[PDB]
Design a protein around this ligand. Sequence first.
Ligand SMILES: CCCCCCCCCCCCCCCCCC(=O)OC[C@H](COP(=O)([O-])OCC(O)COP(=O)([O-])OC[C@@H](COC(=O)CCCCCCCCCCCCCCCCC)OC(=O)CCCCCCCCCCCCCCCCC)OC(=O)CCCCCCCCCCCCCCCCC
Ligand SMILES: CCCCCCCCCCCCCCCCCC(=O)OC[C@H](COP(=O)([O-])OCC(O)COP(=O)([O-])OC[C@@H](COC(=O)CCCCCCCCCCCCCCCCC)OC(=O)CCCCCCCCCCCCCCCCC)OC(=O)CCCCCCCCCCCCCCCCC
Ligand SMILES: CCCCCCCCCCCCCCCCCC(=O)OC[C@H](COP(=O)([O-])OCC(O)COP(=O)([O-])OC[C@@H](COC(=O)CCCCCCCCCCCCCCCCC)OC(=O)CCCCCCCCCCCCCCCCC)OC(=O)CCCCCCCCCCCCCCCCC
Ligand SMILES: CCCCCCCCCCCCCCCCCC(=O)OC[C@H](COP(=O)([O-])OCC[N+](C)(C)C)OC(=O)CCCCCCCCCCCCCCCCC
Ligand SMILES: CCCCCCCCCCCCCCCCCC(=O)OC[C@H](COP(=O)([O-])OCC[N+](C)(C)C)OC(=O)CCCCCCCCCCCCCCCCC
Ligand SMILES: CCCCCCCCCCCCCCCCCC(=O)OC[C@H](COP(=O)([O-])OCC[N+](C)(C)C)OC(=O)CCCCCCCCCCCCCCCCC
Ligand SMILES: CCCCCCCCCCCCCCCCCC(=O)OC[C@H](COP(=O)([O-])OCC[N+](C)(C)C)OC(=O)CCCCCCCCCCCCCCCCC
Ligand SMILES: CCCCCCCCCCCCCCCC(=O)OC[C@H](COP(=O)(O)O)OC(=O)CCCCCCCCCCCCCCC
Lengths: 73, 125, 311, 50, 230, 150, 168, 8, 120
Amino acid sequence: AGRKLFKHYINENIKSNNEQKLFFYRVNRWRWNTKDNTTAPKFLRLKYPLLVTGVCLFAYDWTYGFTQVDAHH
Amino acid sequence: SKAYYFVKNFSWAEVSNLLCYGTKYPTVLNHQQKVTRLYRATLRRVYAHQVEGYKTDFKQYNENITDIGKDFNKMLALKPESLELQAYFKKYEDLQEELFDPAMIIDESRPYAASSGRYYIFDDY
Amino acid sequence: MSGLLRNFEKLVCQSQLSKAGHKLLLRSPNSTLHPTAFYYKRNSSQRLANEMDVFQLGLAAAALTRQANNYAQLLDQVDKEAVREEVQERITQNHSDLNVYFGEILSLFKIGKKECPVQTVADISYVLAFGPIQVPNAAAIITENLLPVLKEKLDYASIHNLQDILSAFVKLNYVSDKELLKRLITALSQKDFPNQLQPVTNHAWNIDQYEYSDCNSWNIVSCGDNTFEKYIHEGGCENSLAKAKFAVHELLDHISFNFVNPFLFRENRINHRFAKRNADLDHEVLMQTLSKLQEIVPETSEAIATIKARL
Amino acid sequence: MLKNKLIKFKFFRFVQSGFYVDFIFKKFSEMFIRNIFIYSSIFFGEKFMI
Amino acid sequence: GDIRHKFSNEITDDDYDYQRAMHVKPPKEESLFQLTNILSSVPVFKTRFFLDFIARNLDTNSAVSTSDFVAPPRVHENSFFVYHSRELGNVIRKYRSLESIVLPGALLTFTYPLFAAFVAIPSYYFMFNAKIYEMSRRFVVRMDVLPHLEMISVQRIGAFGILYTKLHRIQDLEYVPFDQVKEQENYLWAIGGHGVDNQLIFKDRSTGEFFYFERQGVWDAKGLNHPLLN
Amino acid sequence: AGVFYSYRLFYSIFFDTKKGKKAIYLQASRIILNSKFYSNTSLASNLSITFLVLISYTVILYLYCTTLNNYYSLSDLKSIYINNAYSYFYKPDYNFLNAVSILNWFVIILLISVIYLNWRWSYYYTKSIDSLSKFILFSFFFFIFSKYIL
Amino acid sequence: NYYNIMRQVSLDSNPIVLYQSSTFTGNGLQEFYENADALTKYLKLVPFFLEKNLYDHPKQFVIKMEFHPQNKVLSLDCLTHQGVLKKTVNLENLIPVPYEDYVQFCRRKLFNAPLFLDTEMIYFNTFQNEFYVFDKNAKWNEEGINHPELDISKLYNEKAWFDSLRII
Amino acid sequence: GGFQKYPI
Amino acid sequence: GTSIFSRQFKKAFNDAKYQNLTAAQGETYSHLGWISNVDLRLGRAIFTFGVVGIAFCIYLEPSYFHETFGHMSQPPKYDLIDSNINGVEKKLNKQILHREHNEHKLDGFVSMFKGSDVAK
Ligand SMILES: CCCCCCCCCCCCCCCCCC(=O)OC[C@H](COP(=O)([O-])OCC(O)COP(=O)([O-])OC[C@@H](COC(=O)CCCCCCCCCCCCCCCCC)OC(=O)CCCCCCCCCCCCCCCCC)OC(=O)CCCCCCCCCCCCCCCCC
Ligand SMILES: CCCCCCCCCCCCCCCCCC(=O)OC[C@H](COP(=O)([O-])OCC(O)COP(=O)([O-])OC[C@@H](COC(=O)CCCCCCCCCCCCCCCCC)OC(=O)CCCCCCCCCCCCCCCCC)OC(=O)CCCCCCCCCCCCCCCCC
Ligand SMILES: CCCCCCCCCCCCCCCCCC(=O)OC[C@H](COP(=O)([O-])OCC(O)COP(=O)([O-])OC[C@@H](COC(=O)CCCCCCCCCCCCCCCCC)OC(=O)CCCCCCCCCCCCCCCCC)OC(=O)CCCCCCCCCCCCCCCCC
Ligand SMILES: CCCCCCCCCCCCCCCCCC(=O)OC[C@H](COP(=O)([O-])OCC[N+](C)(C)C)OC(=O)CCCCCCCCCCCCCCCCC
Ligand SMILES: CCCCCCCCCCCCCCCCCC(=O)OC[C@H](COP(=O)([O-])OCC[N+](C)(C)C)OC(=O)CCCCCCCCCCCCCCCCC
Ligand SMILES: CCCCCCCCCCCCCCCCCC(=O)OC[C@H](COP(=O)([O-])OCC[N+](C)(C)C)OC(=O)CCCCCCCCCCCCCCCCC
Ligand SMILES: CCCCCCCCCCCCCCCCCC(=O)OC[C@H](COP(=O)([O-])OCC[N+](C)(C)C)OC(=O)CCCCCCCCCCCCCCCCC
Ligand SMILES: CCCCCCCCCCCCCCCC(=O)OC[C@H](COP(=O)(O)O)OC(=O)CCCCCCCCCCCCCCC
């Protein structure tokens, strides 16, 4: 009954978004290239480093691991 | 721009005038020059804080620049001797002051910037 | 959705949800879809008309009338006088509140504020018919105030509202508008009943995923159990165990309304316990109204038969 | 806590500027330099006393 | 533009293959130890036992959405739905459900429950309350309209993931511009308001309660165009 | 305070969204530069940094063995003031052992904040909250199994 | 601000087939099991389904795609670890995405993909926030795809195609 | 990297 | 003329979604197609060294874990020497060993408490 509500304000928001200029989007498109950026967990891979770590720990266990004393607390 | 805001013992009013408009005496400027320079300064500062900033949000940047552009279009339409235009100028000067950042990035292509005069070029004489 | 060593035969497939008119009903915990007790203010610092609307006053009046009728049934079916004194006192309080609320409603209608939802028409009709207070001319006020609103918003009418409107019209002999009565009958016949509706409940922390279930969900926000009815039926004031149980129930209700609903669920409107509608009483009233309508309007016999079949 | 003033750029730049300690010290040092090395020493000292 | 081929000792894509772990390129060949190669080679996985285990013991296709139009079950026999939240609602439900397992489990397992509570209190008051909890309290899981009452039923997630529905009159709904609340609740919108729409906030004037709608939420065209809401 | 500056420096320099001038990236992304010699730094610089890190690790380990080991083998410091501080390094008591946990958990909460806290809208907001919930619940269950169920 | 408003579309009478995978051409997961190529491709996709489930990567391997021009809706038959499912998509909600965008949408390092997963032809439903991946060994209906309703001149939107999905 | 060379 | 689902148009869009429109055609690409080989090798080597160091810290110095999460259940560790003897001999010897262990713990406690005055 002539009351401003969800539909009215959704249309208002759509109009506000449409009023934006595509010039800024066009000039900045290059920034968010997926081929050029990734995440820190993806870049820092621990697969083979953990394998080398396991080798080193195994060597320690079978060389100096025997000569250790249990410390219960 | 000479980028000498923090040198030569500028007062706060002079520094604010330099940031908003290229000149230290905006009264000499005409209406179009004032509006265009203030719009450029506002866009530059918004880009510095919401594009090249800390965890910047590009959607918020777009919305903010759109609102600023509409406001500055209205300002340009308005007559020079209008309290509404004066209020707009005060609002955006306050925004510039709010976004003022000590140690803000100064491009190396401007005078008085870091690395501006690291080398002395020898003349043909 | 996701499971291990499990079968999802009882899960509701997304195909039905994608389809339209799938006849699925949702039963969720702590669901309060009826606004009774929202606008029931025992003490008013000012005139109720100033603060509340006709819709709110009608909801309160209908709730009070139903509670008073239930307590009158308790009086009829109870024998011991000492236990009957409490029932009489509660009935007197309900009658006083109903009188003040209905006086405010009449004053508002006289003033000229009449726009209200369909449930307001239903509640005013159910207060005029089956209500303690008597008005010199109920038909005139129904015609002047409620009739145009009912004609305009009959489509929005619910099953309960249609049943109440038909029952009130039969009781008051307000059957002058045969076309309107036929319109109400056909609307009720077209409506969809809980027998056809298929209840479902949320599945495994998933709002989107639903499972068929025939078990009602717990509702601490508004409990439909009639603790007072149970207390009167079993023992009473004389019975120490019944008195202790009723005291515990009243203390729990007070604690809820005063601390749980505001702090938890952020709701302060509910402050009084109104028992849920009696299914047996509703069924009997509907059957009687349909029987009366069969004689009153011969051409609606098929509609009444279909309504009875769906029921 | 729904309203936090510490996330605002005013507090951010205050902390980033080292609490304005350098600015305050530089202003006081300028006062000392101007009063002692010019007005009191050169003019009052050399021009008047000497 | 590339001149690597002009030299015999220049690096090659075969030399760059080792960067595929840290660099995203479309697959070129399958190594002997890839999951796909292992599954397709080892005959054990071809056994009907393993195939049936895969078919049954995992996420079912029934819960998978099958269309861009959703008609959730009606809350009331006469109501019609308008808005519903898909993913953020489930995420909030699962987060608030932790209070039914972590909290009693923490009490019965931690050596110092008081220490845990003392650590949690300031954690809740800073960076957690405004981050998730207030947004969840004001979050709208579902919205339907009851026309006979001319009301709107809103479903919300409570403590421990409990779902409760409340009624609000359409005459008591108002639109609250984001400018009027941004300064009041800057922190809330700073760290937790991203999921919900900033410019589509409504509130009930009588009860002073807000309604946050998910950005990735489904709206019904018919529900929006219904005359009651217009 | 160390956590915040370390995180900000590392993340903003390397893994944040590209904020620098287009020239910085384009001048180095040209295909002509693709070569076995390609690098934006110096090989000598990389080797110098690597050797510095290795030698620093070795020297720090040597000093730790000299001082913090059960057998004290450091040379004389020519000071006659004994502080008794080594008592809480050799035989710490329950009070101090639990006191250190306060700072440990403060650092843990700060790490969680700098990692899972969102300041800008993203396509991964809901999935980030979900990942936080998964991490919390998995941490609880893993602790339960490690301490009691084994 | 883009809002997911639903239009309640329905299928038409005679659809036009646009995509048909040469493998999985049979009907039913039982037929896939009994067929040699289908079984091996299913085993190779098992990691794909694992990524779907545990890594919360919304994606679907699409086969036997049909188009309804009367209502402008695509009916997709998708293969999941449990069987074949039918889904409906509106052309207004479908946009193309690069393979790197598809990979970077998920924050977990995806398993090494098989060689029959067409990387060029990856599409994105914005309404469902989902990806559709087709099979390289497939047959495309040229006349079907050349339908007027599928033309970019009518389905093109710069803001939606280029700025809707910003993974960062 | 470094500055452009100029005559001395 | 062209329509979606066309391979050529799809490839063009995939390559041009994040292009630099201010650059000439054929050179309007923003991504880096590789990573410095020598730099990546050295970086991965040093990263592996750091990871190995962190793991050795975790293993040989669990003090942080002990004081941040508490002492977790220890995996079983015992010797099967007692299985050599069987019967009443085994029972009596096991009881004697248990008594000796308890007495040893008490002796350590009392010795620690008493020996406060050993150093004069
Ligand atoms: C780029 C990143 C930038 C950085 C981002 C950082 C993000 C985190 C930010 C927050 C981190 C903390 C920052 C520092 C605090 C900032 C405070 C602030 O700004 O508030 C301004 C705000 C006013 O401005 P505003 O515009 O309203 O601000 C908006 C609100 O913040 C809006 O609030 P709201 O409406 O949304 O509701 C929240 C409300 C409520 O929020 C809370 O309460 C938060 C939870 C507080 C937990 C505190 C735990 C402390 C640890 C020990 C106890 C652990 C529990 C143990 C078990 C229980 C106890 C046994 O907030 C508050 O009221 C203020 C927070 C509490 C500040 C307390 C500051 C210390 C007080 C003095 C020391 C007390 C400790 C013991 C001292 C012992 C002797 C040395 O409130 C204040 O005034 C601050 C407190 C002023 C204290 C004055 C001096 C004391 C007053 C007299 C006391 C007399 C006692 C007599 C006793 C007699 C006995 C016989
Ligand atoms: C040989 C046999 C084995 C030997 C023993 C070892 C066995 C275990 C090996 C475990 C190896 C590490 C595994 C990491 C997996 C990460 C991916 C994952 O699981 O995703 C699910 C989940 C993340 O989900 P999401 O969807 O990616 O997160 C949503 C974000 O919006 C997404 O973020 P965004 O993309 O928007 O960008 C923000 C970025 C922010 O990322 C960063 O800024 C750093 C990213 C580092 C990635 C990991 C590289 C390896 C470093 C750790 C090496 C292992 C240390 C020991 C770990 C176990 C200790 C008990 O976010 C992240 O990357 C968060 C995920 C990384 C979590 C692990 C962080 C470790 C370093 C601590 C924070 C350092 C802050 C200062 C900056 C560092 C440089 C100064 O991972 C988590 O569980 C997060 C936990 C976060 C709180 C951890 C607090 C731990 C406090 C107690 C332990 C303290 C000692 C350890 C730290 C000491 C200093 C280095
Ligand atoms: C009789 C047969 C019995 C068979 C028993 C098999 C038992 C299997 C148990 C598996 C338990 C779970 C393992 C999970 C691993 C992934 C964890 C993870 O990433 O989560 C964090 C994840 C985030 O991490 P993200 O990096 O983003 O993940 C990306 C992908 O995961 C992509 O991840 P990524 O590729 O970046 O790295 C993931 C990696 C993680 O791997 C590691 O970290 C382990 C590193 C090695 C440790 C070795 C220790 C033992 C040996 C010590 C050294 C001995 C030296 C001896 C002397 C040598 C002398 C030279 O996964 C593995 O563990 C791979 C297996 C290790 C293969 C190589 C082992 C060494 C072989 C011998 C040396 C030769 C190596 C190759 C050649 C090298 C060059 C010459 O957080 C999540 O969100 C997790 C969500 C849940 C995902 C679950 C997916 C799997 C679901 C499986 C369901 C059950 C299936 C049952 C089938 C049964 C059929 C019958
Ligand atoms: C100075 C005073 C200090 C006081 C400190 C107080 C600390 C203690 C606080 C106690 C909190 C109690 C929380 C109750 C949680 C339930 C609340 C509720 O109604 O939610 C219903 C919710 C929601 O109910 P619903 O009806 O909406 O739906 C049912 C559930 N779904 C949604 C899936 C359909 O249901 C649950 O969450 C059920 C939880 C059941 C299990 C609860 C105990 C789990 C932990 C067990 C002990 C730890 C593990 C031990 C392992 C041993 C292995 C050998
Ligand atoms: C008694 C009132 C109710 C208290 C409820 C409990 C607090 C609120 C819920 C906490 C849930 C998170 C529990 C994580 C348990 C991790 C393992 C552990 O150390 O447990 C034993 C320990 C305590 O067991 P304890 O007391 O036997 O340990 C010995 C004592 N200390 C450790 C001090 C030497 O757990 C904790 O210390 C928890 C501290 C409270 C955390 C409050 C929330 C902040 C963290 C956000 C959630 C994610 C944390 C991830 C941590 C990952 C590892 C660094
Ligand atoms: C005289 C005694 C000498 C003792 C030397 C002790 C060395 C101690 C090293 C401690 C760890 C420090 C690592 C520093 C960096 C070097 C490691 C590194 O960069 O790892 C990353 C690298 C790669 O990191 P990445 O993950 O970036 O690489 C992935 C790409 N590809 C697949 C190509 C590798 O890790 C590995 O390559 C894993 C190696 C695992 C196997 C380790 C043992 C190798 C043994 C070789 C000799 C065998 C002789 C056999 C003789 C038989 C005779 C019959
Ligand atoms: C240019 C190249 C130059 C040569 C390169 C050489 C590479 C580095 C070689 C390092 C060799 C020594 C390794 C020691 C490993 C740690 C030992 C330890 O925990 O000490 C326990 C010893 C045993 O002590 P304790 O048991 O007698 O008593 C300790 C006393 N309380 C109990 C009170 C603490 O403890 C200490 O002495 C204190 C050590 C504190 C520092 C812990 C550091 C942990 C990280 C180790 C990183 C190792 C380097 C990186 C990995 C290298 C892999 C090859
Ligand atoms: C001494 C207390 C020690 C800590 C106790 C923790 C109890 C946890 C269970 C709470 C159950 C009731 C919740 C009620 C919600 C509600 O509607 O709460 C409504 C209330 C009242 O409304 P207002 O305060 O906004 O006006 O809001 C509050 O802020 C007060 C209650 C706060 C309860 C917070 C519970 C979450 C704690 C999270 C700890 C940090 C994270 C831990 C890892 C995940």
